[model samples]
Target chain A: ELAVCDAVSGWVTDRRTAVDLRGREVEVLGEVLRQYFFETRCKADNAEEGGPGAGGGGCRGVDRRHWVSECKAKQSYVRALTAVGWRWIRIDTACVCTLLSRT
Target chain B: RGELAVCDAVSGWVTDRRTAVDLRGREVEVLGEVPAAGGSPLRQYFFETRCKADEGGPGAGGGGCRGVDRRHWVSECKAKQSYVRALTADAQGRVGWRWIRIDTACVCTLLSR
Candidate 1:
């Protein structure tokens, strides 16, 4: 998750510096995506009973849906971010897959 | 001005209403867009209200509706996938659940990676 945040922060900071927002309100919407992703994963892992650690009370599966909805919601936010003069570098799922494969 | 124009206007009005309804449904207090299972919207509404009632707070009853307890709500929402799949046995209908589940898994995988 920290890696994800770092990736997002790097992306936003780079974009923020590039854009000419002298007096404009520049907020990176990607943070919302990161937070949602974190919370969703936490809930999913928390629901399982006797799965791994934390007494194995596995992440409540139902709660996972909230994250799904949030992810969908963030798509719109990303669009809004892009529309407001923020450029998005395409971070495909392949990037994550590649990172995981290396690990 | 013509019959075609009148039909187009009527369709536009319906489309507007549909969009409004979608937004309203998304924003409705105590009516969240949970992944459908055997539970009706009424069931979720009551469950959320009941959970809130159990907590004994003025605004507690509305937490589920407003996506406040989304973590827990989403867990329950995921459960609906299995429930719906069992009931319908329609592979196509289960696609929504599959996508969400995959994304859910992806979040974990991404975190660990």
Candidate 2:
């Protein structure tokens, strides 16, 4: 399924290591919108959301079933700029973005 | 960050206003990137279209919208797919959103399946 996404759209351009519901590591296919400080991806299960069957887990792999699905769309590290203007801050794995009840 | 309600650095489209902060019980987060919106049109349309689509109707579907100008308010959404009705859901789960940062590495996918 990931390969199919690779074959389907150029928007789905980029791979990142994300920690799933489990602490285990996994590869997710998505793209980072530099214009906006955020990113979105796809899972192969929650067809209930966007697809006939494309939202969660690997496209049916070693630990699961159903490797055939489309990109439903998932978001990873979303961020709002702390500075006055947009800054292309390279979000490392540790950019801690918390809320303090003040905008 | 005194009285500085940033738009929850991590925000997605809510009612199409980038209301992630509102969902968190905070006033609209101040950020430069977010577009300007007012007059309750987005809210009115959000609820109108939301109820329309979620309930399945003439809804926010193609041409179902009236009086709202996508050219002005939803220009961001038109430019990007991120600002659609896609939601984290509210306390009522009307949208009944799924989860945060989905991946094959999660512990819930097993149970969700």
Candidate 3:
């Protein structure tokens, strides 16, 4: 997940320094994507870290719909990232594939 | 260590009512928008309410859940592939059409259950 952030940050930096305010759209969209994944990583880490109320049980199968939803949602982000030349998932599928691997 | 509390399906009607909260228990906005590739921005609607124990059990109050049992369920605003067209053309007089993600629903899942 950190890799995802780093890749996005690098892309944003390149895009920002490569052009002027006209490319503001890229910077804004890039930040949104970056923040979303950052929050997601925190959630995943907290789950992996484990603690009280962190589901005192084992990982269970998510609903079929959720599994479907997660994958479908990720693809949308992936497409946008790819459009801007970020292929972290393409090179490292586990970043997301393992998210719902059980299902 | 119990089964995840099932959350209600996301509401279809997008309203001003705050329907969900973030990891820190702050209310999540019902709607938000961000710049997209083109002029038309992408909008996201958060519609998933927090999951609760069947009986409003321990730690269930104020539209939030705490404690071991109730905390298992976590909420997230999930998106689906969507597209939009620019309302106006750029300085070059070229309208842009692009694909972007739009919030489709809010889904809940157990960290572990």
Candidate 4:
């Protein structure tokens, strides 16, 4: 998260950035969209990463729905990172702490 | 990096249901705002949760969020979303959600209580 800290240091000072998530668009302290892939652009039939399959293997509606459900849940949680420890499953934690600490 | 992206919905929110903490007159914490200096000059607010306090379950304490340059709470002064024209205390500020993004049982209350 140190990287994120550094990347957003500029905006952190002024607090002005636009970030678009799903169909909702809002401008905040920093436009974090520079990172992370927006799933709204993909399709369950043929995903850019892996369509819609377990472990990202093939296309499946449930698979996609599950992923979408999970993603939506995660985004909301990510939206509440300050609390730290919700259903938003993450691949990393140290970085968040780092950003929190540094920021 | 390639595993998850902001995905679309196959089955939209049919009839969303969730247990809330019910912050009718809980106490305005005034979580502050995400300090910024970029595009706009709007800010939001948030609050504390039971999960964030006593519980240590799935959706309790965590971080990494966003904006609206608006508020997280409503007229009753309850922390909710990022753009409810409420409040969102950022890195430099101090604060604290319920009836949140997910509400199974006391799940939201679990975090906000």
Tell me, what's the RMSD of every candidate? 22.1, 19.7, 13.4, 18.2
Q: DockQ, in order, for the candidates?
A: 0.05, 0.08, 0.05, 0.04
Q: Write the per-residue lDDT of candidate 4 for residues B13-105, one digit (tens) a residue.
A: 212121222234333333323344124332332221112222222222232121101132111111222211223232454433221222111
Q: Summarize candidate 3's per-residue lDDT along B52-103 as a digit string, tens digits.
A: 2234333222222221133334422122112211122233444332222233
Ranking by lDDT: 3, 2, 4, 1
Which portion of correct inter-chain contacts appears in model 3? 0.00
Q: Alpha-carbon error at B108 in model 3, in Å? A: 12
Task: Give a tens-digit lDDT track for model 1, residues A1-103.
Answer: 2211111211222332212224334443443133111111111233444331121121212122332211110110111133333322222111111111100
The numbered model that scores best in lDDT is 3
Per the 3 Å backbone cut-off, how many clashing residue pairs does candidate 2 have? 22
Error of 3 at B103 (Å): 12
Worst ten in a row by lDDT for model 4 chain B: B104-113
Docking class of 1: incorrect
Interface RMSD of 3: 11.9
**Can you write out model 3's per-residue Cα lDDT over A50-101, one digit (the tens) per residue?**
5221111222333343321121111112223423432222111111111222
lDDT of 1 by residue, B60-80 (tens): 221222222333322111110
Clashing residue pairs, backbone N/CA/C < 3 A, model 3:
none
Q: Chain A TM-score for model 4, please?
A: 0.17
Location of the lowest summed lDDT over 10 successive residues in candidate 4 chain A = A93-102
Fnat per predicted structure, each in turn: 0.09, 0.12, 0.00, 0.00
Whose TM-score is greatest here? 3
